[PDB]
């Protein structure tokens, strides 16, 4: 029998207004092997940090590891100073507390270190956790709601491992060229769960938490997915797709349709992305299979979820632009390398430690690149023209909206509240606006969200202090 779909503890403050998280190491099992992983609350992953709109909340958390870790809160908008970025260091052994002033809509984000130059590797052992933020207007809706039944998170990971069972990382000119990518496909840790789900509708909260793969999700027997949220919240109303594209870092919720004696599988497509479709993935891959149940189930799929303010004019606003580059000798030996070892299969439908860069400039965590406006808006266009890796683009302290798409204006599902952008061979511009403080000592990243690529230099810094005074 197929293991059941693990479902995060849903965990919201104490009568002391605090969240504990412990980062520790443990154990896990794979396919009959054990495996050394971290996890948050646990041995592996972490669970869902529950946050109101408009209410604040204290974190303690306790760095139980050997070695220095962060915790960045992906998709929150928060001053630089809890932000998490790689000068948040929390000492191994140590605490660090922090507090949270959540002040944007309802949406699903999620959290995860980011250790300078490591994160790649922390995030492969198994750190990551979610976030889900309400507020008023969410739960007025009658979406489906029933934690673990019916509105069920969804964290799609692939690991590779040595065959002594332990996960195998290592930040190589191959993986740091292409992305650490797996042969195994985990889902909330599991290998191919099933998730007992009552008849009528169920809301899937779906984080793509690979390193460096892209999926692109679908339904083993083409029933429709209705996207009602993308990463920084619900979009205006649902909308229908027969394939969902998510990129790396990015989260959508979806509604699908259960009924009675017809289960079926989530499953994740082929993609044009460099080593990601060497086998199994060559094919259809199952994520995990819904089951039909008969128990209680209320929730709706609304004609409409939520308004979407006007873009605004862009006349006038500060232009920055952000070239991404990636060093030829490291994009010629890691491609060889890829090759050599898969064949062509690797470009189916198509040292190194400073090699990827902004703005000819390799992350420097002394250095900020440059000081964003405080609460004004700013275009922002970033180029991945003179290479073909995918690059899918974060920005700290926003949820953004995309003007332009590598070449076309953003898919519908993708024109609403946005932490992450697709630049790939081509140009993408959106506008961003901060509403939060970043000083030099903890300054907002942005950078690509594969992560051996920001781990090798794909990162800047930038500070947020103030707005015109002109
Ligand atoms: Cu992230
Ligand atoms: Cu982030
Ligand atoms: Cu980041």
Known sequence: ERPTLPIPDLLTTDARNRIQLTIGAGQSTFGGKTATTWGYNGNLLGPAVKLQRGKAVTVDIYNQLTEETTLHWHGLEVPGEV???????????????????????????????????????????????????????????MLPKQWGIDDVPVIVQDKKFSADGQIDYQLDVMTAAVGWFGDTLLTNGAIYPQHAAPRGWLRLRLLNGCNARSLNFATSDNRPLYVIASDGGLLPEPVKVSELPVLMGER??????????????????????????????????????????????????????????????????????????????????????????????????????????????????????????????????????????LHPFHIHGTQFRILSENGKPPAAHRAGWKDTVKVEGNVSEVLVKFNHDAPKEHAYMAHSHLLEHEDTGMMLGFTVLQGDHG
């Open 252 to 389: 959508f919720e979806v509604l699908v349709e259960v009924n009675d004696n017809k289960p079926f599988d989530l499953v994740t497509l082929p993609v044009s992305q460099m080593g990601m479709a060497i086998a199994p993935f060559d094919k259809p891959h199952p994520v995990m299979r819904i089951q039909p149940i008969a128990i209680s189930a209320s929730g709706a799929l609304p004609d409409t979820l939520s308004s979407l303010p006007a873009l605004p004019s862009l006349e006038g606003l500060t232009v920055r632009k952000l070239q991404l580059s990636m060093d030829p000798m490291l994009d010629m030996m890691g491609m060889q390398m890829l090759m050599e070892k898969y064949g062509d299969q690797a470009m189916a439908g198509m040292d190194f430690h400073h090699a990827n860069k902004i703005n000819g400039q390799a992350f420097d965590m002394n250095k900020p690149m440059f000081a964003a406006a405080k609460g004004q808006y700013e275009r922002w266009v970033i180029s991945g023209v003179g290479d073909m890796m």
């Open 83 to 141: 932000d998490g970025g790689p000068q948040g260091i929390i000492p191994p052994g140590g605490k660090r507390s922090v507090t949270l002033n959540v002040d944007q809509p309802a949406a699903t984000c999620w959290f995860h270190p980011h250790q300078h130059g490591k994160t790649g590797r922390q995030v492969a052992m198994g750190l990551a956790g979610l976030v889900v933020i309400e507020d008023d207007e969410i739960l007025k809706l």
